[PDB]
C-alpha cells in the first residue's frame, strides 16, 4: 500500500466543499490518465483541483494533481484531545513539532509509530475563500455578502422554518429588529415582532422566502438529523464567515449531526478560532474557547513543554499562527483490510480529517 487514508476522511476542496475522500475519488476517477496495478489505481487528473495545505508557513489554497485508490491490510486510528479522530495507513505521515524563536520546526512520523503524548500538527487558521454567487419574486442577494451571512447566522442559531413561516426567538429586542431590518433590506419582505407568550419572537409570513432559504441549505430548524452548514459558507471569504459566526453566537453548540459538527470545526478554523468537539451519548458538543493547555517549545535549542501561561509570556517575547499542536490520547491498530484513498498536492500535504488536520502523503 501507499500513504493513504480512510474513505470517510473529510477533505476541504474548492470545487466540492468539505467532502469525504471516497466521494471525491468517485468524482475524479479516471478523469485524466489512468494506471492500474492489481488492486491499486492512480489517475493523473486532466484538470487539477484546488485543496488546502501548508505552504510558506500558511494554510492556503494549492493544486491537487493526482488521485489514488488501493487496499490496505490494516489501519491506524489516532484520537487526539481536541477530538480529532483520523484513520490512516500505517506508513501515512503526520507532523510532530515545536514552536521556536524562528517559527515552527516540524518532524515527519509514520502513523504506526505515533504514541500517546505526541504533539501532532493541526490546523487552527484557514486562509482562503472567495465571494460566492447565488441563483424574480422575492429579491435575493446575488453574492453571499456579509449581511446575508449575518442573517443566516441568526436564522440557523435560533430560527425555525415551519410551514412557509420563519420564526426567530430571543430577548434583546435590538437583535430581532436587526433581523427584520436585514430581511427587508435583502429580500424586501419584513415581519412583525409577535410578543409570544414564552418570550419575544420575530415572525415572517412568506411562503417563497422559506423556500429559497431551503435551497440555500438552511436547515428547517436546529435539532434535525442532517443538520449541516450551508456549503457556500465553507468556500466564502473570512469576513463573510465572521459575519455569520458573530451572529450564530450571541459558548457551546449541541447537535445530533456528526457531519454538521465537523463542518463547524472547519468554519471556525477559517477564523482562527480554537475549537474542541466532544460526544456525550449520541449528541456532539462543539466548544469554542486560542491554544491547548500545554505547548511544546524549543528553549536553549532543547525541547521543553510549557504550561499555557508561561508559553504566552515566552511567545509575546518573540512575536506571536496557522498551526498548533494537539495531543494524542489514543493510538489503535485495526487489523482489517479496507479500501484506502490519497490525493497528491504540490506541497505533498493537505488539510483533512473530521477537524482540520495537516496530513502528509
Ligand atoms: Ni516528507
Ligand atoms: Ni493567515
Ligand atoms: Ni437570544
Author numbering: -2 to 132, 137 to 251, 256 to 294, 297 to 327, 336 to 376
Question: What did the published study say regarding this structure?
Answer:
The VMA intein from P. horikoshii (PhoVMA) consists of 376 amino acids, which is considerably smaller than canonical HEN-associated inteins, e.g., SceVMA consisting of 454 residues but more similar to the size of the TFIIB intein from Methanococcus jannaschii (MjaTFIIB, 335 residues). The sequence alignment of the archaeal inteins also suggests that PhoVMA intein lacks homing endonuclease activity due to the absence of the active site residues in Blocks C and E. To prevent self-cleavages during protein production, we expressed both inteins in E. coli with alanine substitutions of the catalytic cysteines 1 (Cys1). We solved the crystal structure of the PhoVMA intein at the 2.5 Å-resolution. The crystal structure of PhoVMA intein revealed the typical HINT domain of thermophilic inteins, which contains a β-strand insertion and the HEN domain structure. As expected from the primary structure, the PhoVMA intein lacks the presumed HEN active site residues in both usually conserved LAGLIDADG helices (Blocks C and E). It shows a partial truncation in Block E, hypothetically indicating progressive HEN degeneration. As for the nested HEN domains, the deletion in Block E in the PhoVMA intein causes a truncation of the second LAGLIDADG helix by one turn, thereby removing one of the catalytic aspartate residues. The primary structures and the three-dimensional crystal structures of the VMA inteins suggest that the HEN activity of PhoVMA intein has most likely degenerated during evolution and is inactive due to the lack of active site aspartate residues. The PhoVMAΔHEN intein still retained the protein splicing activity, indicating that the HINT domain of PhoVMA intein is functionally independent of the nested HEN domain without having developed a mutualism.
Inteins catalyze their removal from a host protein through protein splicing. The HINT domain catalyzes the protein splicing reaction, whereas HEN domains often function independently of the HINT domain. In this study, we elucidated crystal structures of HEN-associated archaeal inteins inserted at the same insertion site (VMA-b), which is located within the A subunit P-loop of the vascular-type ATP synthase (VMA) from Thermococcus litoralis (Tli) and Pyrococcus horikoshii (Pho). The two three-dimensional structures highlighted a modular architecture consisting of HINT, HEN, and an accessory domain (ACD).
